Design a protein around this ligand. Structure first.
Ligand SMILES: CC(=O)Nc1ccc(NC(C)=O)cc1
Length: 95
């Protein structure tokens, strides 16, 4: 029986600019799961300290490559659906 659709892994290849961003915080591969992309995005925001010091869910990125990739000047980590849309524009899914 096929793995339930909801359970199937989401395998992705970051487009060149997102891949450059992930490699800047240690990623060394071309292909990832969505979980791994999310891990590296967290590492990148943490390392560059793009988050608001007091309201740490809020990320400022108008003067960052992340803003050009996501197409927003800032966002909240709590915006789960929007963050997915922003990430997917920078990924090719691997069948
Ligand atoms: C470092 C870390 O915690 N990453 C992370 C968190 C939740 C999940 N869950 C599932 C079920 O994918 C996977 C990875």
């Amino acid at each position: 029986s096929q793995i339930p659709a909801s359970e199937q892994e989401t395998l992705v290849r970051p487009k060149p600019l997102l891949l450059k961003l992930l490699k800047s915080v240690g990623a060394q591969k071309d292909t990832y799961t969505m979980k791994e992309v999310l891990f590296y995005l967290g590492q990148y925001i943490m390392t560059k300290r793009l988050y608001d010091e007091k309201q740490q869910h809020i990320v400022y990125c108008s003067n960052d490559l992340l803003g050009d990739l996501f197409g927003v000047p800032s966002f909240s980590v709590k915006e789960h659906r929007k963050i997915y849309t922003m990430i997917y524009r920078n990924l090719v899914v691997v069948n």
